Amino acid sequence: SPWYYGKVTRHQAEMALNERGHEGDFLIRDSESSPNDFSVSLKAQGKNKHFKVQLKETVYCIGQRKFSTMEELVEHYKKAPIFTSEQGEKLYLVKHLS
Amino acid sequence: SPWYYGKVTRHQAEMALNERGHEGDFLIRDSESSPNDFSVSLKAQGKNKHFKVQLKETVYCIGQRKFSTMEELVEHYKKAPIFTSEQGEKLYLVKHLS
C-alpha cells in the first residue's frame, strides 16, 4: 500500500514535515488517539494540520457470522461446520481445490 | 490473496469439483447472482454445495465523505479541498512526503 507512510505519532509526523516538507506535502499514518483509524498530516501555510480518517474494515458475512478476512472465515469452517443437515450431519471445509 | 480461486461460474465450479475434487475440497469464487459477493463451493457427500458470503468492503470516512480506498481519498483531495478556512482559504493535498 504505497499511500501509507508509517506508524508515526502526531509529533513525529510534525517533525518529518518540519524537516523536509513543503506546502501541500502529506503523509498518512495510524491515528494515535484512535489506533485502528488513520490521520492525514498536511503541511499548509507554514503549519501542520491533521485530519482524521475513520476505517470501517471489510466484513465477510456468511449465515449468522461475520469475519474480518476470508482466511479467518476459511479456518473457522475447518473446525466448526459450515452446514449441519437436519439429520445432524456436519459438513466442514477440509482444503482448497488445487 | 491465495484463498481466492477465480471468477468461475457456479456451473464451472461444479465441473472443477467433479473433475478433481474430493470430500471437503472447496473453492471461493465471485458470486454470479450477486457479482460483488462471493460463494464458497464445497464437495461433500458426493454432491456440490454453494454458500453465499456477503462482502461489506472497506469504507474510509473523512468529514462528510466516504471512499472505498485510501488512493481514492487522496486523489479526491488533490482536486477538492480537504479543508476550507473561514476566510475561504482552500487547502489541498499536493504530494506524498518522501
Curated annotation (Swiss-Prot), chains A, B:
Adapter protein which associates with tyrosine-phosphorylated growth factor receptors, such as KDR and PDGFRB, or their cellular substrates. Maintains low levels of EIF2S1 phosphorylation by promoting its dephosphorylation by PP1. Plays a role in the DNA damage response, not in the detection of the damage by ATM/ATR, but for efficient activation of downstream effectors, such as that of CHEK2. Plays a role in ELK1-dependent transcriptional activation in response to activated Ras signaling. Modulates the activation of EIF2AK2/PKR by dsRNA. Interacts (via SH2 domain and SH3 domain 2) with EGFR. Interacts with PAK1 and SOS1. Interacts (via SH3 domains) with PKN2. Associates with BLNK, PLCG1, VAV1 and NCK1 in a B-cell antigen receptor-dependent fashion. Interacts with SOCS7. This interaction is required for nuclear import. Part of a complex containing PPP1R15B, PP1 and NCK1. Interacts with RALGPS1. Interacts with CAV2 (tyrosine phosphorylated form). Interacts with ADAM15. Interacts with FASLG. Directly interacts with RASA1. Interacts with isoform 4 of MINK1. Interacts with FLT1 (tyrosine phosphorylated). Residues 3-97 form the SH2 domain. Phosphorylated on Ser and Tyr residues. Phosphorylated in response to activation of EGFR and FcERI. Phosphorylated by activated PDGFRB. This is SH2/SH3 adapter protein NCK1. It is found in: Cytoplasm; Endoplasmic reticulum; Nucleus. Only the first and third SH3 domains seem to be involved in RASA1-binding; the second SH3 domain and the SH2 domains do not seem to be involved. The chain holds residues 281 to 377 of 377 of the full protein.
